[PDB]
Amino acid sequence: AQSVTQLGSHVSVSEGALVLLRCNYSSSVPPYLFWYVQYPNQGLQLLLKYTSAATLVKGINGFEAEFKKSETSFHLTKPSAHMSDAAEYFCAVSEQDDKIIFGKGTRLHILPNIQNPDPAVYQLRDSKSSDKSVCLFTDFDSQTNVSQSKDSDVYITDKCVLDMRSMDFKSNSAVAWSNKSDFACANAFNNSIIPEDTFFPS
Amino acid sequence: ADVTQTPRNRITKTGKRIMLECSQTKGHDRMYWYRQDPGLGLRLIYYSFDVKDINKGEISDGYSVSRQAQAKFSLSLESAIPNQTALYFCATSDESYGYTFGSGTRLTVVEDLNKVSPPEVAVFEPSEAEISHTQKATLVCLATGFYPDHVELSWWVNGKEVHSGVCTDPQPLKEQPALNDSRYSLSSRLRVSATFWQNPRNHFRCQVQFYGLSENDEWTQDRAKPVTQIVSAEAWGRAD
Secondary structure, rough: OEEEOOOOOOOEOOOOOOEEEEEEOOOOOOOEEEEEEEEOOOOOEEEEEOOOOEEEOOOOHHOOOEEEHHEEEEEEEEOOOHHOOOEEEEEEEEEEOOEEEEEOOOEEEOOOOOOOOOEEEEEEEEOOOOOOOEEEOOOOOOOOOOOOOOOOEEEEEEEEEEEEEHHEEEEEOOOEOOOOOOHHHHHOOOOOOOOOOEEOOO | OOEEEOOEEEEEEOOOOOOEEOOOOOOOOOEOOOOOHHHHEEEEEEEEOOOOEEEOOOOOEEEEEEEOOOEEEEEOOOOOOOHHEEEEEEEEEEOOOOOEEEEEEEEEEOOOOHOEEOEEEEEEEHEEEEEEEHHHHEEEEEEEEEEEOOEEEEEEEEEEOOOOOOEOOOOOOOOOOOOOOOOEEEEEEEEEEHHHOOOOOOOOEEEEEEEEEEOOOOOOOOOOOEEEEEEEEEEEEEOO
């Protein structure tokens, strides 16, 4: 009978923009509703809950959610997306007077505002003795995404965002590597659509 | 409600009975065992309202439970199989849906312990071209050849853990994706200013905590027994 639905396993928001994470429920009688967050590597933390009191529920850190019976909704929102908001969010609902049932979760990805992109592919060498290397594609903006490798002997990671607090500076990167003799960083990302102005040093 | 769970991490072979124990201090009637899996959220296994009361949740098959005391709720994998690999959470509730979760048990079930293998870990030093172009310096750590996928990667600068400037892939990749027991690899980046990399006094270490075999486990191979262990790699800053 009773369920809870979250729309999209992974969602994006631009840094600074409105956060919206959507939850809908299927109970005929209004249930209690809960929003939990799971920050990287950790357990569950309650953000807010609807417990048949106020319909506009306020939570920790600027989060809020409005219970709307007529659209069976309880969408979570925060006015401005910060890099620290990157986490997985779970909507949950009371069921059978005896338990909480959880939605499937939505991971929020925050797209950093990269005002001065400087896309580049660099070659890095092992700190130990080595003709061993990796390739680093870095400093591209939000419009670039990285594709998986077409060569089973070339490994390419998803893009990852780092936040250098020392310089208040965020950047995207992906890493590629191979044991192959004919692997060159100039070709590592040939299955990705990269910026036309990507820097390829020497 | 200091809700506590044991164990925190465990690797087991298939076909073994495994127990996970939940204890609380507030004596709430209601206790729960859930599993978390990517894309599925938290799914309820079993729950209990008193020592005499056991109720199936959505995914009770392959599990049993016992409510040994007001304070204690035990979960058993009856005969562990690989699809029981998961993060397991116990919870308690008061009579108004006030839930308290335990901190989790990360359980991996593998078919064959002979395939367990610690990572090789290497640090790759920053590119001179990055340094010249950006006045920043990105170190890359690469952990390769490990099984199962049950690791924790951290960076340590001058002996202290750092979080700033770090990005670690959220999941390892399979080195041989067509294989059910493929080994895994994981990368991470630590970015610092060029001047901080250029100081030969600064020390950079990538640490990988690997979870594998215990002292209890039989080992019949010539290669090193793949016990739970830390594997690191390091680099010193460099003016040239």
